[PDB]
Write a protein that binds this ligand. Structure first.
Ligand code: FE
Ligand code: FE
Ligand code: FE
Ligand code: FE
Ligand code: FE
Ligand code: FE
Ligand code: FE
Ligand code: FE
Lengths: 429, 428, 433, 429
């Protein structure tokens, strides 16, 4: 007696995509195949692609609207960033205060990341105990010594370090320099964050992490040259992974200029030539996962010139459909690879054993996608606190019809959000 | 209902080994999971590991041979072409072969065409028949025939498989040894040095790249050899490679004590080399393990090492010996074992129905009993000639069942329960 | 005191070219500097560049030529020491007997000095020690050619003898077949000839030889590299620490396929002359110090063998007399290469690679071998200026911006632009131990 | 007539060493060879090696004392460091004052280095105009922005940047850590400055210099791993050179433990196995020059444990003889290579056209060395302000007999310092 059965969809399995049925029980995938039998309920995925359901390894979060946007965007598990939050997630005390405040607002599931900061190097073991899945840092921030000592510690606890990689110093200087000269266009901003500032940062961190004996994950890589640094170190046998985001694949500096401060983000959006290289890296399997790096903010902060506007891209709701359209539909990527880049790889890298793949025993988390079905994103579609996004006015070639988490539909393109917040925090041991 | 359900076994799935059930219908995997229902026949695999049947990409052959394969846990073999009298080099060549094999296949068999110096014009023929690749030796082809042939294959969307050894240098060093009276196993190995393999691989890698042809490097014997393939792959070239159990479980000292039965072309090198190979295998630099089964009449195996015909009769020992050595002795995960013994080969050669325990694939399995030993004896062998360098070896795991397309074709208890039901596999 | 003093010239020393005087005594450089004293004879080189005489590491003397004519062509071209190839002449230089015969024949015919190379062939791997004993400075082979085993075994022995192996690197089989394929299709064009000798045939060959020689433990010298991809292999191998050097020739720097198509069979040679883009690459490699020396690979030929279409024609460039001035013009004048670099590439590097201790260096104690070059002074090469047995060359008709005015060998002027050849032949064979 | 002729010496020429005479006129080498004729004076160098005077590209100065020690040590040209001086050589005024303060004190010639500090990247042109031969900087120190900004300017001026490459931060933290746990041993000190702190810094600087478009010279390399980093970069086509010092070739950590604080220096003296690798690097031409990094100090600051004592090696007077003995005599290095490592390469790298080479038209700067003639270094032999050195007690197998600058003997092992100081500053253009 299965609780649910999803029939006739083109299901994305690890090796291939094929039409098979999925049986669900207790919120977990009970079986996969044909003539599964009877279930309390049945769903018809005919004409739909049933994907595992994004695992956004780079999410900044309020919980109610954000998680809401996530589900709508086909995201069933997010990995919450530690800093950029009221109390910074740096130890048990701080994270438990965060849990309490979130009680009942989670529409999707959430794994957690601890923050590696200049002052909690001796409390790292606390968040490891709690069940965090990794630690984030910027090289607030830590110096080379604190990074080395913190990484050495993380390596011993069996935790990976996640790093934002840019020489902030040279960037801020070039930026201010651009201020004094009156060059505040999207192109001036981008040039104040040249590729070498990313590459030098990546090289520094790769080396120190290696000597510290710590596994490393390079966040949002914006250039092929940055990707190349990650690949060469991996071929040397070092334990590292990297990720990028939809905006580095679907946007370029010219469009950034046209769009405005809404397309402004830390690692900047480079020119089309850079983008073509990124696409080559992606298809070559050199970028482990795609993440949103969703960074929302009050519109009052996105006001002013590019140079003084707050950086960050609000696109948590647009990752799955845009990438399915651009990657699979537009560029012909295989469906299984799409599943890997949006969910499986992140799940494996961060040890979310129950997530990221449609396989027996895993959580029944899915996203139903309607290929060849366009629409133009508009402000009123967004579920964000503030209905603004650099993707508004964009033609998206596919649609998310259903989003299922642990066996229940939490988002339906026709009935909206059918149930009460069903999400839970995920803590690993 | 399902024709069969295999219950409670530790199943080797794609990224994980799991205790789940497998339902089969019409020689196909119908479903995987729990609470599958019922079937005509039910098998309890409790305590057993259920692996995808081995896909041996390097087999030299049918009655005896396919029976040994089945008993060894091999459900699909990829048959070599330059062994048979009429060599598989064209349509009429392979057609004759199909007819003569009539009713002798105990397991399924994919096919390779031969790329020889005189058939570069007929390659498309075998391509049309449906072989999954072409084998060649650099009967043998010169650099020109190889470049010319590879270029054609690359256009046909076919990979070239290559025996990579500088034969000239190997032959001369051996002849040299004959002269000096050096004829032990150690002299034989020293007459087939690592550089003869490396030079050959480097040469073939470059020409295949220029020709625009996909390449698979056969039986690599040294980490140095593997290192060349890895370098090329990182440069973006489409190359894969294989090795054999004899390069991981035997070393020169054992070859010396065993005799001519452990004498093979790229030679079994010393223990240090072996350690390097295990390092490469665990690092995932060797795509698959293959038998390179090459039997022969004992008369040709008599004489000193230098004299003896080279070849390892080990088609029946590939699966259990590697499971024991890799998984039991060295801790390899079950999923990786499955990839190296079956999945990678299927993906490399496009055998979409094989090497994967997944929905819709052929129901080909081998049941392995972990921590259960026996000593391989001549009696146990299904080969035409009951000899093998593995005879007398203590193996810590046993094959209890082999299933091909839903049917048990080998049972540790019954032997061969059904008439040969294997089929040739031709891909289009 | 001194026998000769060359005054006021711009002398190419090892690290700089500068106006300084040179004193000579007993065929050797006695001193270098200012106010050297006086000499039996004084030459005024004001306005001229005084360079070390070229050391041609790749010379073929006859398939028609001979010591008399080729050696005079060399002197007129500014070459004072040639390193003779072994497998061209009829009695191939493969052992004691064959070289001694060669010597007896060349008696009194040498206008310039000549070091010697032995040949590594399939049947003399056992005799190699003989030429080493005589004193050749290296062994040449084509991979009568040697198969991979013969090359490996021979290089191993040479490495034991402390002798370098020089190799013509081209996958001949593929080249021949591709050539026969252009033939069948009626494609006998220069551009077609070049295409039947694609870059990968040179790269595959260099790769194979580099590896085998490394395993044989033998020092290697790659002959006439025609493409930057070929040079890149050598550089990579040297950066891995392998003992190897390589050379190229002026035809791969001053001619391209289009000019080759215009010139005809006289511009046909084994590694083919690639296109202009390939040439650009070669200049970059040369200026970057990745090509150790420039050599002629002078390969004279009877006019009957150069007749007909490009595929049928005998390959080989006759340019022994044009290496120095052409390259001085192209490299130093047109491209700005420093004079000392020019000296290294045309003389010093070859001398060092082959252990010619008395040559290619204008420094105290070395042989007084010089060539006087008149810069920014052009002339047009004509068949009549050629000293070869057969007066033809793809460089005929070329306007060269510098001229060789004098060539001095061991203290004596052997070629003078106003007088011709002043003295009877006095070159000697150079045998090293 | 020639003013002087040195006869019968084994002269180190560029290509080889041989017995030839050297003619001098007006302080310049007038000629080289045999039968040079007559001169006002004639020196017999029979049985001696005549080497070009050493060009020490890294010395810290006072002038009267340091210069005498230099001359007695066989050094004829030094390249003076800018920082860590009374006023710092960072601009016109600073160096101008320098010249006047040194008047009449120079026993040997001195080319000059300017400092690249945080407060003068806009004055760099001043020292370039005066004729400095390069600029030294650390990591006052400059941050990544100041380093990049200044190197960019230096590159435009055609000036090389010289850098002390160690991750200062991490070394200081590991050090404090040691003298917190009670580890104040020489072996503890070296461990507090691990090889990775030098590799990281070298990697950072190489890359930034590369992007800034500035020629770079890596100061006192202490490990083969560091040299390998420089070698890689050069093989990639970057204009980079590097140096090391005798103490990294002639001393190891055990000997340092034995000697005490006199052998304590910034990049630390590594273990014997590391020294082996260094010799290997030196022999295959991966290290352009050998410099002294002479750094004397009051013996007061050398009291106490290794952890709190001042770092610096007083060995200006012992570079030539110790290296001649170790490299050539003990290890079989050819004389022409010895000359390049001790003089020619430095001269070429820093444009000292008249120095480092025995060739026509160059300054008549030489040092006469008596091979296989030993002695034990004594405090008394030292000409330093403070007669102390980690080389005291050392058996040195060759001796400096005479030092000649611009044709005049300024040091004689039997007469001492015969002439009044005749050294001059060298400013290039
Ligand atoms: Fe960030
Ligand atoms: Fe972020
Ligand atoms: Fe084989
Ligand atoms: Fe085989
Ligand atoms: Fe040739
Ligand atoms: Fe030739
Ligand atoms: Fe320093
Ligand atoms: Fe210093």
């Amino acid at each position: 007696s299965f609780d649910l059965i999803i029939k006739n969809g083109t299901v994305i399995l690890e090796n291939e995509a094929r039409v098979v049925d999925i049986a669900v029980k207790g919120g977990k995938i009970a079986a996969i195949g044909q003539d599964l039998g009877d279930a309390k309920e049945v769903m018809d995925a005919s004409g739909l692609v049933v994907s595992p359901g994004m695992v956004d390894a780079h999410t900044h979060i309020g919980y109610e609207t954000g998680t809401r946007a996530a589900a709508k965007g086909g995201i069933t598990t997010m990995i919450e960033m530690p800093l950029n939050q009221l109390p910074a997630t740096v130890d048990r005390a701080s994270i438990e205060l965060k849990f309490d405040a979130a009680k009942g607002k989670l529409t999707i599931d959430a794994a957690q990341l601890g923050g590696l900061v200049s002052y909690n190097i001796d409390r790292l073991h606390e968040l490891d105990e709690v069940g965090v899945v990794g630690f984030k840092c910027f090289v607030r921030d830590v110096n080379d010594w604190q990074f080395f000592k913190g990484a050495q510690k993380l390596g011993e606890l069996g935790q990976p370090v996640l790093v934002h990689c840019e020489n902030a110093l040279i960037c801020d200087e070039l930026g201010e320099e651009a201020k004094r000269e009156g060059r505040v266009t999207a192109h001036d901003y981008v040039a104040s964050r040249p590729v070498f500032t990313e590459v030098e940062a990546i090289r520094r961190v790769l080396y120190l992490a290696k000597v510290a004996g710590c596994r490393l994950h390079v966040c949002h890589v914006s250039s092929p040259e940055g990707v190349e640094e990650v690949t060469r170190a991996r071929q040397e046998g070092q334990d590292i992974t990297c990720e990028s985001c939809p905006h580095y694949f679907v946007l370029d500096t010219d469009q950034f200029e046209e769009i405005g401060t809404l397309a402004k983000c830390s690692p900047p959006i480079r020119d089309l030539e850079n983008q073509k290289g990124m696409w080559e890296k992606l298809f070559n399997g050199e970028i482990d996962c795609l993440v949103s790096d969703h960074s929302p903010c009050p519109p009052e902060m996105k006001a002013g010139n590019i140079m003084k506007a707050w950086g960050g891209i609000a696109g948590l709701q647009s990752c799955m459909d845009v990438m399915f359209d651009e990657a699979v539909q537009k560029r012909g990527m295989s469906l299984p690879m799409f599943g890997k880049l949006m969910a499986t790889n992140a799940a494996d890298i961060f040890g979310l054993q129950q997530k990221g793949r449609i396989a027996p025993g895993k959580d029944a988390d899915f996203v139903f996608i309607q290929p060849n079905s366009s629409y133009v994103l508009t402000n009123d579609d967004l579920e964000y606190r503030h209905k603004v996004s650099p993707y508004v006015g964009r033609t998206i070639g596919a649609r998310i019809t259903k989003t299922i988490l642990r066996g229940d539909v939490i988002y339906d393109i026709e009935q909206g959000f059918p149930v009460a917040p069903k999400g839970q925090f995920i803590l690993k041991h």
